[PDB]
């Protein structure tokens, strides 16, 4: 797996507080657009919600 991009999931119940950051939720999965970033890793919700997401609360599913 990991052809070009990977999927990540939020371990805890994190919530947004800024337009830039993206609201998350447990058992919620997204995609990875920017893994190079050390702090936040861009994600794209199926719904179409794009914003910066945490790195520690997110982990690559690694299929």
């Amino acid at each position: 797996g990991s052809p070009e991009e990977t999927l990540v999931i939020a371990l805890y119940d994190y919530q947004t507080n800024d337009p830039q950051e993206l609201a998350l939720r447990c058992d919620e999965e997204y995609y990875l657009l920017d893994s190079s970033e050390i702090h936040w890793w861009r994600v794209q919700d199926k719904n179409g919600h794009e914003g910066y997401a945490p790195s520690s609360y997110l982990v690559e599913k690694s299929p």
Binding site: I38, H39, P54, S56
Partner: protein, 108 residues
């Protein structure tokens, strides 16, 4: 910049020690800093119970040094600071580019 005045700043402590020292805290948001080689770029050692692969995990956000006029210290591509102390105060609350937004300082 007499950083010895602050607690997050700690040069006498090594990186390896910084990892275990924060672990002793056992708290979410536990943040600390460590003097790096660069005379103008320490290291923000952030500890938070997270990541499933390995927990507890230690996050090290090296301060981005963008030698500008002024501006140089920053870790979020959002706002830039001319002093580390500022980055520590701003992130301590409001809303910054930290996976846990500094909220709990630690001493060496």
């Amino acid at each position: 910049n007499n950083l010895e005045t602050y607690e997050w700043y700690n040069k006498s402590i090594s990186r390896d020690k910084a990892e275990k020292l924060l672990l002793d805290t056992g708290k979410e948001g536990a943040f600390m800093v460590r003097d790096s080689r660069t005379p103008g770029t320490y290291t923000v050692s952030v500890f938070t119970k997270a990541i499933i692969s390995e927990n507890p995990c230690i996050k090290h956000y090296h301060i981005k040094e963008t030698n500008d006029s002024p501006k140089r210290y920053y870790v979020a591509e959002k706002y830039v600071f001319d002093s580390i102390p500022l980055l520590i105060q701003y992130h301590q609350y409001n809303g910054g580019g930290l996976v846990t937004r500094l909220r709990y300082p630690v001493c060496g």
